[PDB]
Design a protein around this ligand. Structure first.
Ligand code: NAG
Length: 241
């Protein structure tokens, strides 16, 4: 038993309060006002549309999903109020619209869950979620295996080395800082060779001295890195078979 997340949008609560104080007086008999608003409140206080799905309803959305559901509800409600509909027909249309809007919102949430909730496959992604139970907006840590799979990079001698540390979800993550690239030497020391906002390390015209191990770390405002990727560079001399 969980609220319909649209109530966490202030414009929705305002439009609902406006329905009650401004619309009801000229459009529904006074003796029904209390019972209507109770029925509206009950519709908004429970959202069951996703609670028998294979993927359990988690009670969270992102701001994008919230805004899309809210805008869809506000537009449909405004169509009712702009129409100036009254009485029995107004009641029928209002509750029909709320059912439809819950089903529309369910579609948006199932899609958020399937595609946009913690979409990383490794590393730690930070994403702001709104928790529908209390309308709290917080940064959630999407913690996955720190192993992103080692990259085997073979570069012909004299060609350009590109080491790419970017993952598909990095552009969407919160709290990121810099990509640092380290060369990891066989004598158990390391050298920081680049640090900045760029997700790649480029070395033009590679020679043997550029072969070996590299580690990329994408920093976070938190303690742990958002991503660690290891690269092994083999520099292929022309003489190889
Ligand atoms: C460790 O190896 C690196 C790369 O070969 C080199 O720059 C460094 O001087 C070595 N350190 C020692 C103490 O031998």
């Amino acid at each position: 038993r969980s609220p319909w997340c649209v109530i966490c949008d202030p414009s929705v609560v305002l439009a609902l309060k406006s329905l009650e104080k401004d619309y009801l007086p000229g459009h529904l008999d006074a003796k029904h006002h209390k019972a209507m608003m109770e029925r509206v409140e009950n519709a908004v206080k429970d959202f069951q549309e996703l609670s028998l799905n294979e993927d359990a309803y988690m009670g969270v959305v992102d701001e994008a999903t919230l805004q899309k559901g809210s805008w869809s509800l506000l537009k449909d409600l405004k169509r009712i109020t702009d129409s100036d509909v009254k009485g029995d027909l107004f009641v029928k249309e209002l509750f029909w619209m709320l059912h439809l809007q819950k089903e529309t919102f369910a579609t948006y949430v199932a899609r958020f869950q399937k595609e946009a909730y913690c979409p990383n496959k490794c590393g730690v992604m930070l994403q702001t979620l709104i928790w529908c139970k209390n309308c709290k907006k917080e940064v959630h840590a999407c913690r996955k295996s720190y192993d992103c799979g080692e990259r085997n990079v073979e570069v012909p001698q004299m060609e350009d080395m590109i080491l790419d540390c970017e993952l598909n979800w990095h552009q969407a993550s919160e709290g990121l800082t810099d990509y640092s690239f380290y060369r990891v030497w066989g004598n158990n020391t390391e050298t920081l060779v680049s640090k900045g906002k760029e997700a790649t390390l480029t070395k033009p015209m590679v020679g043997p001295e550029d072969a070996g191990s590299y580690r990329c770390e994408l920093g976070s405002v938190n303690s742990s890195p958002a991503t660690i990727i290891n690269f092994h560079v083999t520099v292929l001399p022309k003489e190889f078979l």
